[PDB]
Symmetry: C2
């Protein structure tokens, strides 16, 4: 008996404005979806599209009109044709190409609502066994090795269980060697941001000595055949992030043996059902995965942490505590470490009771709603 | 220099309702991009995004905000760069937008209006500017499917009587072999293509293989956009070329297609690919790979249709275009003079140094549901 869909557009000041090409990003623009049934029971979710289409093609502005004028009307029409199963929600959105982050916002709000409605932990409905998740810190490159080392020192001293070092041609082996020299037992992964070419196979192979968890995006996006050849020659798992947009590119990856680890963003995949399907494909291929982040508000952070509880999510998540992102977030209690470098998996039956509604009112720049029966 | 950009959101009544997906609709929404320089020289283009995101992920609503709030500001910033100081080279305009992912139909509208402005500024035919040699192009007709084989054959005769040099039949499992067999027997020498719109699955391969007996020019989009290896295996099993349209959105996807042997024919739509420069890069790669290409349609207004016929002049565009005369689609279009056959089934390639002079300003104005203008030097616009 879902009755209302309310879209909230928010701007939250970032604690640590991020550098871009021509300036800086100081606010997180996010869209929260709030679903309300006839009895007042709610489910919420966050569309993770970023303000500018620099990381994927969706951005807050285009997500907003996609929800308002296309996906919400479709969802309402589908509702008006017979209790609701959150596993079937994407059937309403059958005919829509891409727009997976806008689609995810609807689909995840419906799961969140259904957890609230049934009073069952959302993580339990999805099949998440893990009770706590380890968290990684990402470290930028530095021309100075001493500066890189200090950044690792500071991370380890803040509790972190994994570090992920950015690397690139001429700025890889020296750094990783010096880090592994200093911390023989630390989990270290590397992120190459597509800076290597197939000729660099021997350099990457050289890194096998350091027992990296994975090397993320070694080659340009869509160098699929080159990637499959490169992974065949490396003992270290290749990890893909933006190269795998959908369950399809995942099947391509599996068939070619092009990578062994996935950076999963449930919103980018199109929601919880899509994440579960991806983990099925991945598990059958003998791959493993971890949850990456999109500097989410606490609503999306909660859902990401729940996804990180899923069995195949064997590596550390990039989702840190709220206070690494925002001075003030949208939850009554911020997400925080429960042990150094470790976060408790959210056991809420839906996030709604955890939302600070005064904080959502204050950060809102626009609101739009519709009666789903109309 | 270029001083103003005006975006026009249009709604054009159609002669009769066009087929949606599961519906029909009365009116074609379109976005035109208009650029004006300090001397009053103009370029136009059409953003080909459809009203619903059912063919690709872009639609009218999202393309409008992408243009207003993201791409036009980026383009203004680039126009003020020292390197655009004396000449604006349309070849390089995509560098203003190099940090945007996807959004290729919105990107293409910028890029193509700049090409168009540049031809008008230099008084050179846009087609020669892009290396398009053909002087004329042949035109195909798309025929819907009916559970009546009579309706079908009647539709085919009607297309043929009108001179169309190809027919493309809509097909689906259970309504494929019978229609094609009948048309092929009746028309032994007619170019026939088929468009499956993703209606087949890998288990249907035996049915599609039965189709090789009819010598189709291609079968378009046989499978969903679900798995590249299913496609590769199907094409390897078929003597008939597979044609991809929406499955190929970029030159890199075309590289992968060719590497997989997943298809042999490309439906080119410059807007879907990211503009004229992207289209030339796609044709390079398709020709190197042994693929044939042709230009498809998006129910374009006159602006988009003119630009699409100019791309269809390019050397590798070896098959007929789906871009037919204005009047098949609209009582009143945005050109002073409708696009028409020069001979039955044939259209003269536009020789305009830009389409600006051909635009009916009154029609553009009547069909406008929204209009946004911006001073390109400052960045103040209004509604």
């Amino acid at each position: 008996s879902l009755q209302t869909c309310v879209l909230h557009r928010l701007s939250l000041p970032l604690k640590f404005p991020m550098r871009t090409a021509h300036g800086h990003i100081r606010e997180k623009q996010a869209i929260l979806v709030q679903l309300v049934d006839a009895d007042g029971i709610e489910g919420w979710s966050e569309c993770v599209a970023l303000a500018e289409p620099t990381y994927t093609e969706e951005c807050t502005d285009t997500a907003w009109v996609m929800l308002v004028h296309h996906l919400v009307p479709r969802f309402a029409r589908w509702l008006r044709a017979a209790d609701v199963d959150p596993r079937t929600v994407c059937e309403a959105l059958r005919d829509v190409r891409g727009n997976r982050m806008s689609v995810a916002a609807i689909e995840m709000a419906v799961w969140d609502w259904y957890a609230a409605r049934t009073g069952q932990p959302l993580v339990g409905l999805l099949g998440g066994g893990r009770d706590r998740v380890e968290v990684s810190a990402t470290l930028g490159m530095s021309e100075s090795l001493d500066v890189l080392i200090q950044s690792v020192d500071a991370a380890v001293e803040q509790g972190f269980r994994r570090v992920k070092l950015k690397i690139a041609p001429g700025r890889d082996r020296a750094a990783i060697k010096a880090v592994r020299l200093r911390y023989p037992d630390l989990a270290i992964a590397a992120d190459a941001n597509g800076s290597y070419r197939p000729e660099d196979a021997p350099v990457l192979r050289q890194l096998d000595a350091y027992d990296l968890q994975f090397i993320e995006q070694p080659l340009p996006e869509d160098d699929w055949f080159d990637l499959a050849k490169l992974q065949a020659s490396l003992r270290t798992p290749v990890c893909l992030d933006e190269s795998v947009r959908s369950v399809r590119e995942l099947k391509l990856t599996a068939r070619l043996g092009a990578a062994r680890v996935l950076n999963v963003k449930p919103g980018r995949l199109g929601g919880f059902g899509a994440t579960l399907r991806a983990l099925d494909v991945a598990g059958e291929a003998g791959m493993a995965a971890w949850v990456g982040g999109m500097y989410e508000t606490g609503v999306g952070r909660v859902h990401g942490l729940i996804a990180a509880a899923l069995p195949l999510m064997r590596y550390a998540t990039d989702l840190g505590p709220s206070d690494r992102y925002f001075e003030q977030d949208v939850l009554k209690e911020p997400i925080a470490f429960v042990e150094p470098g470790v976060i408790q998996v959210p056991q809420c039956a839906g996030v709604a009771d955890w939302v600070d509604r005064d904080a959502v009112r204050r950060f809102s720049t626009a609101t739009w709603s519709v009666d789903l029966r109309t």
